[PDB]
Amino acid sequence: LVSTEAQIQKMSQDLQLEALTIQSETQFLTGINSQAANDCFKTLIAAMLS
Amino acid sequence: GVLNQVLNDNIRNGHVVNQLMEALMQLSRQQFPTMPVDYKRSIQRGILLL
């Protein structure tokens, strides 16, 4: 997977956020982990098979 | 007697830049709709320093 810190910093240039407050200024960037990327791919494949 | 590889006559003159800086001088004048205004500023500024 693409790393999280190299993705939010690319995502914070398009939204033109402020410095140091990328999580509080917009609620766009919340819950973006790699733990929840793998969790959603598993729970979409396994919910259709069962 | 030595086969050597020669650049073009436009690069050796410098006339190839007068084809470039009339191409990215029209690309700076084209306003473009699908992008936000802070993205138009960041391309038009870096195309001005060159």
Side-chain angles (χ1 to χ4, degrees), chain A residues 22-43:
Chain A
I22 56 180
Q23 296 132 30
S24 162
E25 201 273 329
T26 46
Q27 305 282 347
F28 278 26
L29 315 169
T30 190
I32 298 187
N33 311 331
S34 279
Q35 183 174 14
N38 184 31
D39 197 312
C40 167
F41 181 84
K42 285 195 170 223
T43 197

mmCIF file with all atom_site columns, all heavy atoms in Angstrom, chain A residues 22-43:
data_model
loop_
_atom_site.group_PDB
_atom_site.id
_atom_site.type_symbol
_atom_site.label_atom_id
_atom_site.label_alt_id
_atom_site.label_comp_id
_atom_site.label_asym_id
_atom_site.label_entity_id
_atom_site.label_seq_id
_atom_site.pdbx_PDB_ins_code
_atom_site.Cartn_x
_atom_site.Cartn_y
_atom_site.Cartn_z
_atom_site.occupancy
_atom_site.B_iso_or_equiv
_atom_site.pdbx_formal_charge
_atom_site.auth_seq_id
_atom_site.auth_comp_id
_atom_site.auth_asym_id
_atom_site.auth_atom_id
_atom_site.pdbx_PDB_model_num
ATOM 1   N N   . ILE A 1 22 ? -3.793  19.722  10.081 1.00 0.00 ? 22 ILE A N   1
ATOM 2   C CA  . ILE A 1 22 ? -4.429  19.024  8.973  1.00 0.00 ? 22 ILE A CA  1
ATOM 3   C C   . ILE A 1 22 ? -5.587  18.149  9.438  1.00 0.00 ? 22 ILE A C   1
ATOM 4   O O   . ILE A 1 22 ? -6.446  17.785  8.627  1.00 0.00 ? 22 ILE A O   1
ATOM 5   C CB  . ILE A 1 22 ? -3.388  18.186  8.212  1.00 0.00 ? 22 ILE A CB  1
ATOM 6   C CG1 . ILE A 1 22 ? -2.686  17.221  9.167  1.00 0.00 ? 22 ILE A CG1 1
ATOM 7   C CG2 . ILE A 1 22 ? -2.376  19.089  7.536  1.00 0.00 ? 22 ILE A CG2 1
ATOM 8   C CD1 . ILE A 1 22 ? -1.643  16.358  8.507  1.00 0.00 ? 22 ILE A CD1 1
ATOM 9   N N   . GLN A 1 23 ? -5.642  17.806  10.725 1.00 0.00 ? 23 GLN A N   1
ATOM 10  C CA  . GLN A 1 23 ? -6.693  16.945  11.248 1.00 0.00 ? 23 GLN A CA  1
ATOM 11  C C   . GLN A 1 23 ? -7.862  17.720  11.835 1.00 0.00 ? 23 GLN A C   1
ATOM 12  O O   . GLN A 1 23 ? -8.960  17.164  11.948 1.00 0.00 ? 23 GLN A O   1
ATOM 13  C CB  . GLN A 1 23 ? -6.120  16.018  12.321 1.00 0.00 ? 23 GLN A CB  1
ATOM 14  C CG  . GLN A 1 23 ? -5.080  15.049  11.798 1.00 0.00 ? 23 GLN A CG  1
ATOM 15  C CD  . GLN A 1 23 ? -3.837  15.021  12.662 1.00 0.00 ? 23 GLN A CD  1
ATOM 16  O OE1 . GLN A 1 23 ? -3.905  15.240  13.870 1.00 0.00 ? 23 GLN A OE1 1
ATOM 17  N NE2 . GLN A 1 23 ? -2.691  14.760  12.043 1.00 0.00 ? 23 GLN A NE2 1
ATOM 18  N N   . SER A 1 24 ? -7.653  18.979  12.214 1.00 0.00 ? 24 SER A N   1
ATOM 19  C CA  . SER A 1 24 ? -8.691  19.785  12.843 1.00 0.00 ? 24 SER A CA  1
ATOM 20  C C   . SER A 1 24 ? -9.331  20.799  11.907 1.00 0.00 ? 24 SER A C   1
ATOM 21  O O   . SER A 1 24 ? -10.483 21.180  12.131 1.00 0.00 ? 24 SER A O   1
ATOM 22  C CB  . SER A 1 24 ? -8.123  20.526  14.054 1.00 0.00 ? 24 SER A CB  1
ATOM 23  O OG  . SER A 1 24 ? -8.964  21.604  14.419 1.00 0.00 ? 24 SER A OG  1
ATOM 24  N N   . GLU A 1 25 ? -8.613  21.253  10.876 1.00 0.00 ? 25 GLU A N   1
ATOM 25  C CA  . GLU A 1 25 ? -9.151  22.279  9.987  1.00 0.00 ? 25 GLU A CA  1
ATOM 26  C C   . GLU A 1 25 ? -10.256 21.699  9.113  1.00 0.00 ? 25 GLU A C   1
ATOM 27  O O   . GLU A 1 25 ? -11.385 22.201  9.098  1.00 0.00 ? 25 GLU A O   1
ATOM 28  C CB  . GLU A 1 25 ? -8.024  22.878  9.139  1.00 0.00 ? 25 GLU A CB  1
ATOM 29  C CG  . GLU A 1 25 ? -8.315  24.251  8.550  1.00 0.00 ? 25 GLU A CG  1
ATOM 30  C CD  . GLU A 1 25 ? -9.017  24.206  7.225  1.00 0.00 ? 25 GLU A CD  1
ATOM 31  O OE1 . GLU A 1 25 ? -8.787  23.242  6.478  1.00 0.00 ? 25 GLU A OE1 1
ATOM 32  O OE2 . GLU A 1 25 ? -9.800  25.131  6.923  1.00 0.00 ? 25 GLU A OE2 1
ATOM 33  N N   . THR A 1 26 ? -9.949  20.627  8.392  1.00 0.00 ? 26 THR A N   1
ATOM 34  C CA  . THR A 1 26 ? -10.943 19.841  7.681  1.00 0.00 ? 26 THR A CA  1
ATOM 35  C C   . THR A 1 26 ? -11.073 18.476  8.335  1.00 0.00 ? 26 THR A C   1
ATOM 36  O O   . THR A 1 26 ? -10.086 17.910  8.815  1.00 0.00 ? 26 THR A O   1
ATOM 37  C CB  . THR A 1 26 ? -10.575 19.652  6.211  1.00 0.00 ? 26 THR A CB  1
ATOM 38  O OG1 . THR A 1 26 ? -9.195  19.284  6.109  1.00 0.00 ? 26 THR A OG1 1
ATOM 39  C CG2 . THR A 1 26 ? -10.842 20.914  5.419  1.00 0.00 ? 26 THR A CG2 1
ATOM 40  N N   . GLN A 1 27 ? -12.297 17.951  8.351  1.00 0.00 ? 27 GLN A N   1
ATOM 41  C CA  . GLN A 1 27 ? -12.547 16.577  8.749  1.00 0.00 ? 27 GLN A CA  1
ATOM 42  C C   . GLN A 1 27 ? -12.465 15.618  7.575  1.00 0.00 ? 27 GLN A C   1
ATOM 43  O O   . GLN A 1 27 ? -13.000 14.509  7.652  1.00 0.00 ? 27 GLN A O   1
ATOM 44  C CB  . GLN A 1 27 ? -13.906 16.467  9.436  1.00 0.00 ? 27 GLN A CB  1
ATOM 45  C CG  . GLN A 1 27 ? -14.059 17.406  10.609 1.00 0.00 ? 27 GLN A CG  1
ATOM 46  C CD  . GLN A 1 27 ? -13.357 16.905  11.853 1.00 0.00 ? 27 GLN A CD  1
ATOM 47  O OE1 . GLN A 1 27 ? -12.952 15.747  11.931 1.00 0.00 ? 27 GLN A OE1 1
ATOM 48  N NE2 . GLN A 1 27 ? -13.207 17.781  12.836 1.00 0.00 ? 27 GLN A NE2 1
ATOM 49  N N   . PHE A 1 28 ? -11.817 16.037  6.488  1.00 0.00 ? 28 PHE A N   1
ATOM 50  C CA  . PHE A 1 28 ? -11.616 15.171  5.334  1.00 0.00 ? 28 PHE A CA  1
ATOM 51  C C   . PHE A 1 28 ? -10.673 14.029  5.675  1.00 0.00 ? 28 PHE A C   1
ATOM 52  O O   . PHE A 1 28 ? -10.903 12.881  5.280  1.00 0.00 ? 28 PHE A O   1
ATOM 53  C CB  . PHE A 1 28 ? -11.038 15.978  4.168  1.00 0.00 ? 28 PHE A CB  1
ATOM 54  C CG  . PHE A 1 28 ? -12.055 16.756  3.367  1.00 0.00 ? 28 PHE A CG  1
ATOM 55  C CD1 . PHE A 1 28 ? -13.256 17.173  3.917  1.00 0.00 ? 28 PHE A CD1 1
ATOM 56  C CD2 . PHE A 1 28 ? -11.782 17.091  2.053  1.00 0.00 ? 28 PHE A CD2 1
ATOM 57  C CE1 . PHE A 1 28 ? -14.161 17.892  3.173  1.00 0.00 ? 28 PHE A CE1 1
ATOM 58  C CE2 . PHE A 1 28 ? -12.687 17.808  1.304  1.00 0.00 ? 28 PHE A CE2 1
ATOM 59  C CZ  . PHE A 1 28 ? -13.877 18.207  1.865  1.00 0.00 ? 28 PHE A CZ  1
ATOM 60  N N   . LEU A 1 29 ? -9.608  14.332  6.413  1.00 0.00 ? 29 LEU A N   1
ATOM 61  C CA  . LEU A 1 29 ? -8.536  13.383  6.686  1.00 0.00 ? 29 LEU A CA  1
ATOM 62  C C   . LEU A 1 29 ? -8.699  12.805  8.088  1.00 0.00 ? 29 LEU A C   1
ATOM 63  O O   . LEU A 1 29 ? -7.951  13.116  9.010  1.00 0.00 ? 29 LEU A O   1
ATOM 64  C CB  . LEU A 1 29 ? -7.187  14.074  6.544  1.00 0.00 ? 29 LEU A CB  1
ATOM 65  C CG  . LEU A 1 29 ? -7.040  14.970  5.321  1.00 0.00 ? 29 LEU A CG  1
ATOM 66  C CD1 . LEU A 1 29 ? -5.785  15.795  5.423  1.00 0.00 ? 29 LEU A CD1 1
ATOM 67  C CD2 . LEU A 1 29 ? -7.027  14.139  4.072  1.00 0.00 ? 29 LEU A CD2 1
ATOM 68  N N   . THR A 1 30 ? -9.686  11.935  8.241  1.00 0.00 ? 30 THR A N   1
ATOM 69  C CA  . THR A 1 30 ? -9.879  11.245  9.506  1.00 0.00 ? 30 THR A CA  1
ATOM 70  C C   . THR A 1 30 ? -10.012 9.751   9.251  1.00 0.00 ? 30 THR A C   1
ATOM 71  O O   . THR A 1 30 ? -10.583 9.329   8.241  1.00 0.00 ? 30 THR A O   1
ATOM 72  C CB  . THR A 1 30 ? -11.091 11.812  10.297 1.00 0.00 ? 30 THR A CB  1
ATOM 73  O OG1 . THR A 1 30 ? -11.097 11.277  11.625 1.00 0.00 ? 30 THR A OG1 1
ATOM 74  C CG2 . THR A 1 30 ? -12.432 11.537  9.625  1.00 0.00 ? 30 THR A CG2 1
ATOM 75  N N   . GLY A 1 31 ? -9.404  8.961   10.133 1.00 0.00 ? 31 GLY A N   1
ATOM 76  C CA  . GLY A 1 31 ? -9.466  7.513   10.037 1.00 0.00 ? 31 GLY A CA  1
ATOM 77  C C   . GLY A 1 31 ? -8.803  6.918   8.815  1.00 0.00 ? 31 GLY A C   1
ATOM 78  O O   . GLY A 1 31 ? -9.192  5.831   8.379  1.00 0.00 ? 31 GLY A O   1
ATOM 79  N N   . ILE A 1 32 ? -7.820  7.602   8.237  1.00 0.00 ? 32 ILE A N   1
ATOM 80  C CA  . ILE A 1 32 ? -7.085  7.083   7.090  1.00 0.00 ? 32 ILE A CA  1
ATOM 81  C C   . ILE A 1 32 ? -5.848  6.379   7.642  1.00 0.00 ? 32 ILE A C   1
ATOM 82  O O   . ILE A 1 32 ? -4.852  7.015   7.985  1.00 0.00 ? 32 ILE A O   1
ATOM 83  C CB  . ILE A 1 32 ? -6.729  8.188   6.094  1.00 0.00 ? 32 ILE A CB  1
ATOM 84  C CG1 . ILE A 1 32 ? -8.006  8.813   5.534  1.00 0.00 ? 32 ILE A CG1 1
ATOM 85  C CG2 . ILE A 1 32 ? -5.882  7.643   4.955  1.00 0.00 ? 32 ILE A CG2 1
ATOM 86  C CD1 . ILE A 1 32 ? -7.779  9.798   4.414  1.00 0.00 ? 32 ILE A CD1 1
ATOM 87  N N   . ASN A 1 33 ? -5.932  5.058   7.766  1.00 0.00 ? 33 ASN A N   1
ATOM 88  C CA  . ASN A 1 33 ? -4.834  4.214   8.214  1.00 0.00 ? 33 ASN A CA  1
ATOM 89  C C   . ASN A 1 33 ? -4.576  3.152   7.160  1.00 0.00 ? 33 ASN A C   1
ATOM 90  O O   . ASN A 1 33 ? -5.260  3.082   6.139  1.00 0.00 ? 33 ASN A O   1
ATOM 91  C CB  . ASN A 1 33 ? -5.143  3.527   9.550  1.00 0.00 ? 33 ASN A CB  1
ATOM 92  C CG  . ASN A 1 33 ? -5.653  4.476   10.605 1.00 0.00 ? 33 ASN A CG  1
ATOM 93  O OD1 . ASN A 1 33 ? -5.329  5.660   10.606 1.00 0.00 ? 33 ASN A OD1 1
ATOM 94  N ND2 . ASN A 1 33 ? -6.466  3.958   11.514 1.00 0.00 ? 33 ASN A ND2 1
ATOM 95  N N   . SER A 1 34 ? -3.582  2.311   7.417  1.00 0.00 ? 34 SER A N   1
ATOM 96  C CA  . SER A 1 34 ? -3.432  1.082   6.656  1.00 0.00 ? 34 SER A CA  1
ATOM 97  C C   . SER A 1 34 ? -4.117  -0.094  7.325  1.00 0.00 ? 34 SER A C   1
ATOM 98  O O   . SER A 1 34 ? -4.369  -1.102  6.662  1.00 0.00 ? 34 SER A O   1
ATOM 99  C CB  . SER A 1 34 ? -1.956  0.753   6.457  1.00 0.00 ? 34 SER A CB  1
ATOM 100 O OG  . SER A 1 34 ? -1.414  1.494   5.382  1.00 0.00 ? 34 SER A OG  1
ATOM 101 N N   . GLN A 1 35 ? -4.411  0.012   8.621  1.00 0.00 ? 35 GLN A N   1
ATOM 102 C CA  . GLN A 1 35 ? -5.178  -1.019  9.311  1.00 0.00 ? 35 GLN A CA  1
ATOM 103 C C   . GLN A 1 35 ? -6.613  -1.063  8.818  1.00 0.00 ? 35 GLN A C   1
ATOM 104 O O   . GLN A 1 35 ? -7.203  -2.143  8.729  1.00 0.00 ? 35 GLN A O   1
ATOM 105 C CB  . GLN A 1 35 ? -5.143  -0.768  10.817 1.00 0.00 ? 35 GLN A CB  1
ATOM 106 C CG  . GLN A 1 35 ? -5.845  -1.810  11.661 1.00 0.00 ? 35 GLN A CG  1
ATOM 107 C CD  . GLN A 1 35 ? -5.649  -1.573  13.141 1.00 0.00 ? 35 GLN A CD  1
ATOM 108 O OE1 . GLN A 1 35 ? -5.211  -0.502  13.554 1.00 0.00 ? 35 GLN A OE1 1
ATOM 109 N NE2 . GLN A 1 35 ? -5.971  -2.573  13.949 1.00 0.00 ? 35 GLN A NE2 1
ATOM 110 N N   . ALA A 1 36 ? -7.182  0.089   8.478  1.00 0.00 ? 36 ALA A N   1
ATOM 111 C CA  . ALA A 1 36 ? -8.552  0.161   8.001  1.00 0.00 ? 36 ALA A CA  1
ATOM 112 C C   . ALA A 1 36 ? -8.666  0.019   6.491  1.00 0.00 ? 36 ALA A C   1
ATOM 113 O O   . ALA A 1 36 ? -9.783  -0.093  5.982  1.00 0.00 ? 36 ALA A O   1
ATOM 114 C CB  . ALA A 1 36 ? -9.192  1.475   8.443  1.00 0.00 ? 36 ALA A CB  1
ATOM 115 N N   . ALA A 1 37 ? -7.553  0.034   5.762  1.00 0.00 ? 37 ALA A N   1
ATOM 116 C CA  . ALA A 1 37 ? -7.597  -0.311  4.347  1.00 0.00 ? 37 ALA A CA  1
ATOM 117 C C   . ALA A 1 37 ? -7.722  -1.811  4.165  1.00 0.00 ? 37 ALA A C   1
ATOM 118 O O   . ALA A 1 37 ? -8.515  -2.281  3.346  1.00 0.00 ? 37 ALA A O   1
ATOM 119 C CB  . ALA A 1 37 ? -6.348  0.196   3.634  1.00 0.00 ? 37 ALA A CB  1
ATOM 120 N N   . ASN A 1 38 ? -6.932  -2.574  4.918  1.00 0.00 ? 38 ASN A N   1
ATOM 121 C CA  . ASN A 1 38 ? -7.009  -4.025  4.862  1.00 0.00 ? 38 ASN A CA  1
ATOM 122 C C   . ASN A 1 38 ? -8.305  -4.540  5.462  1.00 0.00 ? 38 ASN A C   1
ATOM 123 O O   . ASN A 1 38 ? -8.811  -5.581  5.034  1.00 0.00 ? 38 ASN A O   1
ATOM 124 C CB  . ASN A 1 38 ? -5.813  -4.630  5.586  1.00 0.00 ? 38 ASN A CB  1
ATOM 125 C CG  . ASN A 1 38 ? -5.767  -6.124  5.478  1.00 0.00 ? 38 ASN A CG  1
ATOM 126 O OD1 . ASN A 1 38 ? -6.203  -6.697  4.486  1.00 0.00 ? 38 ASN A OD1 1
ATOM 127 N ND2 . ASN A 1 38 ? -5.247  -6.774  6.505  1.00 0.00 ? 38 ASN A ND2 1
ATOM 128 N N   . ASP A 1 39 ? -8.863  -3.823  6.437  1.00 0.00 ? 39 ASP A N   1
ATOM 129 C CA  . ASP A 1 39 ? -10.091 -4.266  7.087  1.00 0.00 ? 39 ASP A CA  1
ATOM 130 C C   . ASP A 1 39 ? -11.283 -4.133  6.149  1.00 0.00 ? 39 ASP A C   1
ATOM 131 O O   . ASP A 1 39 ? -12.174 -4.985  6.166  1.00 0.00 ? 39 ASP A O   1
ATOM 132 C CB  . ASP A 1 39 ? -10.292 -3.458  8.373  1.00 0.00 ? 39 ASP A CB  1
ATOM 133 C CG  . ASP A 1 39 ? -11.293 -4.080  9.338  1.00 0.00 ? 39 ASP A CG  1
ATOM 134 O OD1 . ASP A 1 39 ? -12.406 -4.479  8.946  1.00 0.00 ? 39 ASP A OD1 1
ATOM 135 O OD2 . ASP A 1 39 ? -10.948 -4.171  10.533 1.00 0.00 ? 39 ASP A OD2 1
ATOM 136 N N   . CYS A 1 40 ? -11.294 -3.115  5.289  1.00 0.00 ? 40 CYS A N   1
ATOM 137 C CA  . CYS A 1 40 ? -12.428 -2.899  4.397  1.00 0.00 ? 40 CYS A CA  1
ATOM 138 C C   . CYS A 1 40 ? -12.391 -3.821  3.189  1.00 0.00 ? 40 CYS A C   1
ATOM 139 O O   . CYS A 1 40 ? -13.446 -4.241  2.705  1.00 0.00 ? 40 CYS A O   1
ATOM 140 C CB  . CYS A 1 40 ? -12.458 -1.442  3.942  1.00 0.00 ? 40 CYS A CB  1
ATOM 141 S SG  . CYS A 1 40 ? -13.545 -1.065  2.558  1.00 0.00 ? 40 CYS A SG  1
ATOM 142 N N   . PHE A 1 41 ? -11.200 -4.151  2.694  1.00 0.00 ? 41 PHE A N   1
ATOM 143 C CA  . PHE A 1 41 ? -11.094 -5.095  1.591  1.00 0.00 ? 41 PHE A CA  1
ATOM 144 C C   . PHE A 1 41 ? -11.476 -6.498  2.024  1.00 0.00 ? 41 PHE A C   1
ATOM 145 O O   . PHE A 1 41 ? -12.022 -7.260  1.225  1.00 0.00 ? 41 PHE A O   1
ATOM 146 C CB  . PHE A 1 41 ? -9.674  -5.076  1.042  1.00 0.00 ? 41 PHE A CB  1
ATOM 147 C CG  . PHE A 1 41 ? -9.438  -6.002  -0.118 1.00 0.00 ? 41 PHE A CG  1
ATOM 148 C CD1 . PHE A 1 41 ? -9.753  -5.610  -1.400 1.00 0.00 ? 41 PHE A CD1 1
ATOM 149 C CD2 . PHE A 1 41 ? -8.850  -7.246  0.070  1.00 0.00 ? 41 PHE A CD2 1
ATOM 150 C CE1 . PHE A 1 41 ? -9.511  -6.446  -2.466 1.00 0.00 ? 41 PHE A CE1 1
ATOM 151 C CE2 . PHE A 1 41 ? -8.608  -8.078  -0.995 1.00 0.00 ? 41 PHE A CE2 1
ATOM 152 C CZ  . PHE A 1 41 ? -8.941  -7.677  -2.258 1.00 0.00 ? 41 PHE A CZ  1
ATOM 153 N N   . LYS A 1 42 ? -11.196 -6.857  3.275  1.00 0.00 ? 42 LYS A N   1
ATOM 154 C CA  . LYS A 1 42 ? -11.590 -8.169  3.769  1.00 0.00 ? 42 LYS A CA  1
ATOM 155 C C   . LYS A 1 42 ? -13.091 -8.245  3.992  1.00 0.00 ? 42 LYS A C   1
ATOM 156 O O   . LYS A 1 42 ? -13.716 -9.257  3.669  1.00 0.00 ? 42 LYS A O   1
ATOM 157 C CB  . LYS A 1 42 ? -10.852 -8.490  5.062  1.00 0.00 ? 42 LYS A CB  1
ATOM 158 C CG  . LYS A 1 42 ? -9.402  -8.854  4.881  1.00 0.00 ? 42 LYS A CG  1
ATOM 159 C CD  . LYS A 1 42 ? -8.854  -9.490  6.132  1.00 0.00 ? 42 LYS A CD  1
ATOM 160 C CE  . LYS A 1 42 ? -7.492  -10.069 5.869  1.00 0.00 ? 42 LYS A CE  1
ATOM 161 N NZ  . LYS A 1 42 ? -7.355  -11.409 6.484  1.00 0.00 ? 42 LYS A NZ  1
ATOM 162 N N   . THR A 1 43 ? -13.691 -7.190  4.530  1.00 0.00 ? 43 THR A N   1
ATOM 163 C CA  . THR A 1 43 ? -15.097 -7.233  4.904  1.00 0.00 ? 43 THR A CA  1
ATOM 164 C C   . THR A 1 43 ? -16.038 -6.904  3.754  1.00 0.00 ? 43 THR A C   1
ATOM 165 O O   . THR A 1 43 ? -17.255 -6.939  3.946  1.00 0.00 ? 43 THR A O   1
ATOM 166 C CB  . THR A 1 43 ? -15.365 -6.296  6.082  1.00 0.00 ? 43 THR A CB  1
ATOM 167 O OG1 . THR A 1 43 ? -16.622 -6.631  6.672  1.00 0.00 ? 43 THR A OG1 1
ATOM 168 C CG2 . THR A 1 43 ? -15.407 -4.859  5.639  1.00 0.00 ? 43 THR A CG2 1
#
